[PDB]
Design a binder for this molecule. Structure first.
Ligand code: SF4
Length: 183
């Protein structure tokens, strides 16, 4: 828990390693104090995959959902705690819950209004993507190349370009490669 814990996953140091999908999920969670089902699964299983323990995951999700008075702890415990425990096997289930790879993410239902799951290289408009990439210090020529990949449907290549420019396709591989480059 020394490096990956409920508090450090909100740090800039750790979150600088997140791919765009995880950044988007963390932003929706930070702003709305909630995520709908597919986003809860995408994010919680990514965080389990980077080493967030069961106890630290319950801290993370309970604090995020009850922040700013969004819901009481009693409501969290009655309506969400079991679902997060289930994703960690803590009620004894033996289902496979491995982190989702990019193909799995892309194959989930596309996000609608109020959804943060999916792949931003597909799901965002070029103008939203461009603004995000500018905030990550990419230049116009870089952005044009990333958008070219997006328009061709090559979302994982777009994401690989972003990795290269800011330093099997899998968000956890993006994280691990980026985090290794901090060490
Ligand atoms: S390509 Fe994969 S890791 Fe990158 S933003 Fe899309 S789903 Fe996430």
């Amino acid at each position: 828990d020394d490096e990956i814990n409920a508090q450090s996953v909100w740090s800039e140091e750790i979150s600088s390693n997140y791919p765009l999908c995880i950044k988007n999920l963390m932003e929706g969670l930070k702003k709305n104090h909630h995520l709908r089902y597919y986003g809860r699964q995408q994010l919680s299983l990514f965080l389990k995959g980077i080493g967030l323990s069961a106890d630290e995951a319950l801290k993370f999700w309970s604090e995020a959902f009850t922040r700013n008075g969004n819901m009481t702890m009693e409501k969290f415990n009655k309506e969400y705690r079991l679902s997060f425990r289930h994703n960690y096997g803590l009620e004894g289930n033996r289902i496979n819950y491995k982190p989702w790879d990019c193909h799995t993410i892309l194959s989930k239902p596309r996000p609608g209004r109020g959804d943060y799951h999916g792949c931003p290289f597909r799901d965002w408009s070029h103008e939203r993507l461009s603004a995000e990439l500018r905030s990550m210090k990419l230049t116009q020529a870089q952005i044009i190349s990333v958008l070219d990949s997006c328009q061709k449907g090559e979302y994982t290549i777009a994401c690989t370009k972003v990795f290269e420019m800011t330093h099997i396709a899998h968000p956890n591989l993006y994280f691990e490669r980026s985090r290794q480059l901090q060490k």
